Amino acid sequence: TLETWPQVIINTYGTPPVELVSGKGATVTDDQGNVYIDLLAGIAVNALGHAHPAIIEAVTNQIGQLGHVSNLFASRPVVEVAEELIKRFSLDDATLAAQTRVFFCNSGAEANEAAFKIARLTGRSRILAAVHGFHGRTMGSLALTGQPDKREAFLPMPSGVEFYPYGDTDYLRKMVETNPTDVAAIFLEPIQGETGVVPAPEGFLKAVRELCDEYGILMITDEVQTGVGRTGDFFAHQHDGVVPDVVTMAKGLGGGLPIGACLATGRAAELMTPGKHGTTFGGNPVACAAAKAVLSVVDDAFCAEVARKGELFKELLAKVDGVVDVRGRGLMLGVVLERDVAKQAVLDGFKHGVILNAPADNIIRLTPPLVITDEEIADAVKAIAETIA
Amino acid sequence: STLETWPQVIINTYGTPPVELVSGKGATVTDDQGNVYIDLLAGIAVNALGHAHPAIIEAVTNQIGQLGHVSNLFASRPVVEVAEELIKRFSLDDATLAAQTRVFFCNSGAEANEAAFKIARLTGRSRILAAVHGFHGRTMGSLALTGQPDKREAFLPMPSGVEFYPYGDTDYLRKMVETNPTDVAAIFLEPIQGETGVVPAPEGFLKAVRELCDEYGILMITDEVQTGVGRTGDFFAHQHDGVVPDVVTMAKGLGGGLPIGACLATGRAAELMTPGKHGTTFGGNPVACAAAKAVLSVVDDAFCAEVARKGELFKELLAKVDGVVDVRGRGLMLGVVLERDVAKQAVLDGFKHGVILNAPADNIIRLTPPLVITDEEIADAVKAIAETIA
């Protein structure tokens, strides 16, 4: 596996240090039988952990019935998932739900490519994206990503994107006001994932929403990582009390199966007309079966349990020597460390039975399966403490 | 309830479909009213083995109960085995060519061409040449590469650098290159053009594109997303012409109904993608790759020889059908040329005669059935086409 990995896989990720074979709830096992507590979830994708019974049942049922059908044909699962996304998006406002639609694709990148294309249908040249933002690695999504060293090699980028400091309301408003009626869309992560874990400051998503409302700009929330109950609400942006024009989704929606989604309400939904956008695998019946199972489990009470478990983590880690602050909400958390020792904590965490992630030198990201138990959270905090000590 | 809820919940990119499919097996699918049709489209050449093929059922049911998504921060078995298996098919027992080739996994044709587009940008060269009527995908990079003006116009500005040549016109493409030859990153082409009907590369064209790419340091990039996984009677449609490309893009049939894509690169192409230069979370998905493994196990050299046999049978039975001028293509990627511009009409009437057809142009019916269609089902499919146009 690892021996034959570098002879066949394009060296885009290096060679992985561990091979995983199996997993269950918030635990995973390697090719030697070592069991770790998973605090990464394949980068916030495994919302229900590995082999969740809801997902197994949904996927085995569906694979024995019907796999890929084109969008030349209708399929029960895509529609059920569209319906439930629009319901969770609308928070009981039937008028909003009735103006909302979803376009299905296969990744966050593809999902931000559909939002990019909606931006272009506004007839406006300017797109605004945050510094340290990440929207994906396809050419549109990379254009939107606020990370120079990722873009350089592949210039020229599809034109139009400019970058603002995340949460600088003053800068963003002036930036818009330099040429307001030519701003198609403003893209933002409700909490920035790639950088570290940087929540939208208090009032920022409202500010952006109101600024979008004058000047007729689309507000686009990248919920690829923050979505499906990770932050304590179904959508991070729901906590800031905003109705975005466009929401992009992937990772946690498909429960270990490749899925993406571009939700658009109002004008934005009407902008995509027949023939303007498309994807072959869009609405895959098996991945949409896994999505429905995830949406049946990740309800209002399960999302509340994520919020409490995130507060439990913050409480236990503030008492740990080595940690200065824990930022984020629910199970999207960034442990800020006293010393730049995060990379070494990930490498020494494996010995303490824990899979960590270090987006920076002073930051450990905790993106565990939302099904994680309180006991696993307590064992994980002790593991982080005895790794950093 | 499915067709009634669709328009209320799905962005109108595709309209409301006329038909809700509920189940399928081999070369047939069944709608929510229980009518059964011979499937001559396979979701646009995706279901190489049909719906609910036992190999894919076992493969996926077994993998979903062990491990699904694990990032590329980690290794899992199914990815490396599919990669190893695709490099063996690509390489044709030339173990040097195999040792110099690598695969990046993604979730679609679009994502696979996005990776190829990026390989091209990593040449330091600005010009990328793509075919008129060529179709590489609907993301901004893959759309850039797509030689259909009406698909790109609403989305300008495109990533810069794409220029379009007439498919098969050697002297034109030679001349186009020679305007600035050391500044051509890559030439892109379908070995057989898919979405504008079924136009195969003229005899000698792929050899000529290889000679041309070789003398000026251009990457030859074969989009095999529709033509790949055995559809044309060879594993890769480019193998019929005896050329080795620098980059091969794949999806559709590779997944047998599950989302997957792949960008294979050999030699310098393979080296251009260094750690951190590209990525995707879902790339190398254990469930999709498990389905891909099972597809590859059924689509062996013998099955590909059989795809060729079944292709020649369709052409032979369709030659004797009134209304048909010609059947273009190879294996089970076929373009049925009509005397009248009645292809779209034939699709709607097809339903009534127990067939799913598809009309990529006004006078072309494109046939892309599951490769598992039997001689007997082909015969009934033609009879239905004859009676449909009749």
| Cis bond before residue B159 (omega within 30° of 0) | no
Q: Catalogue all structural domains in chain B, each as residue range(s) with its CATH number.
A: 18-48+301-389 (3.90.1150.10), 61-298 (3.40.640.10)
B contact test, residue of A69, A124, A286 with most B CBs within 10 A = A69
Contact A294, A55 (CB under 8 A): yes
The answer to whether the CB atoms of B159 and A157 lie below 8 A apart is: yes
List the structure tokens of A374. 């309180």
How far does the CA of residue A364 sit from the closest CA of chain B (Å)?
A: 15
Residues with Cβ within 8 Å of A388's Cβ and at least 6 positions away in sequence, in order, are A320, A321, A322, A323, A337, A341, A345
The answer to whether the CB atoms of A274 and B12 lie below 8 A apart is: yes
Contact A193, A226 (CB under 8 A): yes
In 3D space, the residue among B126, B52, B177, B280 whose CA is nearest the CA of residue A59 turns out to be: B52
Q: Give A110's contacts in chain B (Cβ within 8 Å).
A: 107-108, 110-111, 139
Rounded-to-integer distance, Cα A86 and Cα B147, Å: 35
Helix (H, G, I), strand (E, B) or coil at A85: helix
Contact A172, A134 (CB under 8 A): no
Rounded-to-integer distance, Cα A70 and Cα A79, Å: 14
Q: Give B29's contacts in chain A (Cβ within 8 Å).
A: 66, 69
Rounded-to-integer distance, Cα A375 and Cα A324, Å: 23
CB atoms near residue B328 (< 10 Å): 18
Nearest neighbour of B141 by CB, restricted to A82, A139, A277: A139
Q: Give A5's contacts in chain B (Cβ within 8 Å).
A: 75, 80
Q: Chain B contact for A59, CB < 8 A?
A: yes
Query: Which ranges of chain A does DSSP label H, i.e. alpha helix?
Result: 41-44, 53-63, 76-90, 94-98, 108-121, 139-144, 148-151, 169-178, 204-213, 267-271, 285-297, 300-317, 342-349, 374-388
The answer to whether the CB atoms of B111 and A116 lie below 8 A apart is: no
Rounded to whole angstroms, what are the CA distances from A272 to A121, A249, A276, B263, B382? Answer: 8, 18, 6, 29, 37
Rounded-to-integer distance, Cα A123 and Cα A128, Å: 15
Q: Give A59's contacts in chain B (Cβ within 8 Å).
A: 60-61, 64, 287
- B223 labelled binding-site residue: yes
Rounded-to-integer distance, Cα B70 and Cα B283, Å: 9
In 3D space, the residue among B352, B234, B282 whose CA is nearest the CA of residue A258 turns out to be: B282
Rounded-to-integer distance, Cα A98 and Cα B298, Å: 46
In 3D space, the residue among B142, B147, B123, B107 whose CA is nearest the CA of residue B246 turns out to be: B123
What single DSSP character describes residue A74?
A: B
Helix (H, G, I), strand (E, B) or coil at A19: strand
Q: Residue A118: closest CA among chain B residues belongs to which residue?
A: B155
In 3D space, the residue among A102, A85, A155, A106 whose CA is nearest the CA of residue A284 turns out to be: A106
Nearest neighbour of A23 by CB, restricted to B67, B258, B281: B67
CB atoms near residue B209 (< 10 Å): 26
Helix (H, G, I), strand (E, B) or coil at A176: helix
The answer to whether the CB atoms of A40 and B73 lie below 8 A apart is: yes
Q: What are phi and psi of A248, to 5 degrees?
A: -110, 140
B residues 345-384 lying closer than 8 A (beta carbon) to A = 358
- Concatenated DSSP letters of A228-296: TTTTSSSSGGGGGT---SEEEE-GGGGTTS--EEEEEETHHHHHS-TTSS--SSTT-HHHHHHHHHHHH
Rounded-to-integer distance, Cα B125 and Cα A129, Å: 28
Q: Chain B contact for A273, CB < 8 A?
A: yes
Q: Chain B contact for A246, CB < 8 A?
A: no
The answer to whether the CB atoms of B159 and A153 lie below 8 A apart is: no
Contact B344, B21 (CB under 8 A): no
The answer to whether the CB atoms of B74 and A42 lie below 8 A apart is: yes
Q: Chain A contact for B75, CB < 8 A?
A: yes
CB atoms near residue B342 (< 10 Å): 17
Cβ burial A68-84 (10 Å sphere, 16+ → b, else e): bbbbbbbbbbbbbbbbb
List the structure tokens of B281. 């979370």
Full 3-state SS string of chain B: CHHHHHHHHECCCCCCCCCEEEEEECCEEEECCCCEEEECCHHHHCCCCCCCCHHHHHHHHHHHCCCCCCCCCCECHHHHHHHHHHHHHHHCCCHHHHHCEEEEEECCHHHHHHHHHHHHHCCCCCEEEEEECCCCCCCHHHHHCCECHHHHHHHCCCCCCEEEECCCCHHHHHHHHHCCHHHEEEEEECCEECCCCCEECCCCHHHHHHHHHHHHCCEEEEECCCCCCCCCCCCCHHHHCCCCCCEEEECHHHHCCCCCEEEEEECHHHHCCCCCCCCCCCCCCHHHHHHHHHHHHHCCHHHHHHHHHHHHHHHHHHHCCCCEEEEEEECCEEEEEECCCCHHHHHHHHHHCCEECCCCECCEEEECCCCCCCHHHHHHHHHHHHHHHC
In 3D space, the residue among B79, B48, B64 whose CA is nearest the CA of residue A287 turns out to be: B64
Rounded-to-integer distance, Cα A252 and Cα B281, Å: 11
Q: Give A55's contacts in chain B (Cβ within 8 Å).
A: 64, 68
Contact B262, B225 (CB under 8 A): no
Integer-rounded Cα Rg, in Å, for chain A is: 21
How do beta strands B162-165 and B333-338 pair? unpaired
- B226 labelled binding-site residue: yes
First-to-last C-alpha distance (Å) of chain A: 34
Q: Give A277's contacts in chain B (Cβ within 8 Å).
A: 11, 13, 138
Rounded-to-integer distance, Cα B265 and Cα B101, Å: 6
Q: Chain B contact for A101, CB < 8 A?
A: yes
Q: Strand A27-30's sheet: what is its strand order?
A: A20-24, A27-30, A35-38, A354-355
Amino acid at B11: I
The answer to whether the CB atoms of A40 and B71 lie below 8 A apart is: yes
How far does the CA of residue B204 sit from the closest CA of chain A (Å)?
A: 31
Rounded-to-integer distance, Cα B238 and Cα B220, Å: 11
Rounded to whole angstroms, what are the CA distances from A193 to A129, A197, A363, A380? Answer: 14, 5, 11, 21
The answer to whether the CB atoms of A68 and B258 lie below 8 A apart is: yes
In 3D space, the residue among B172, B203, B204 whose CA is nearest the CA of residue B187 turns out to be: B172
- B110 labelled binding-site residue: yes
Contact A163, A154 (CB under 8 A): no
Rounded-to-integer distance, Cα A136 and Cα A194, Å: 10
Q: Chain A contact for B40, CB < 8 A?
A: no
Rounded-to-integer distance, Cα B242 and Cα B209, Å: 12
Contact A198, A239 (CB under 8 A): no
Rounded-to-integer distance, Cα A42 and Cα B221, Å: 31
Q: Which helix (H) or strand (E) holds A368?
A: none
Length of chain A: 389
Residues with Cβ within 8 Å of A207's Cβ and at least 6 positions away in sequence, in order, are A169, A172, A173
Q: Which helix (H) or strand (E) holds A27?
A: strand A27-30
Query: Experimental method used, please?
Result: X-ray
B residues 188-227 lying closer than 8 A (beta carbon) to A = none
The answer to whether the CB atoms of B68 and A50 lie below 8 A apart is: yes
In 3D space, the residue among A387, A311, A354 whose CA is nearest the CA of residue A35 turns out to be: A354
Rounded-to-integer distance, Cα B58 and Cα B140, Å: 37
Length of chain B: 390
Q: Chain B contact for A43, CB < 8 A?
A: yes
- Give burial (CB, 10 Å; 0-12/13-18/19+) of A151: middle
Amino acid at B142: S
Q: Give B296's contacts in chain A (Cβ within 8 Å).
A: none
Q: Chain B contact for A49, CB < 8 A?
A: no
Q: Which helix (H) or strand (E) holds A341?
A: none
Calculated CA dihedral for residues B313, B319, B324, B326, nearest 10 degrees: 80
Rounded-to-integer distance, Cα B368 and Cα B311, Å: 10
Nearest neighbour of A272 by CB, restricted to B11, B74, B118: B11
List the structure tokens of A243. 């109705």
**C-alpha angle with apex B233: B232 to B236, nearest 5 degrees?**
65
Q: Give B260's contacts in chain A (Cβ within 8 Å).
A: 258
Contact B137, B110 (CB under 8 A): yes
Q: Residue A8: closest CA among chain B residues belongs to which residue?
A: B102
Amino acid at A31: D
The answer to whether the CB atoms of A1 and B52 lie below 8 A apart is: no
What single DSSP character describes residue A157?
A: P
The neighbouring-strand residues paired with B222 are B189, B248
Q: Chain A contact for B46, CB < 8 A?
A: yes
A contact test, residue of B64, B151, B223, B246 with most A CBs within 10 A = B64
First-to-last C-alpha distance (Å) of chain B: 35
Helix (H, G, I), strand (E, B) or coil at A220: strand
| Cis bond before residue B202 (omega within 30° of 0) | no
Which residue in this structure is represented by tokens 């998503």? A205
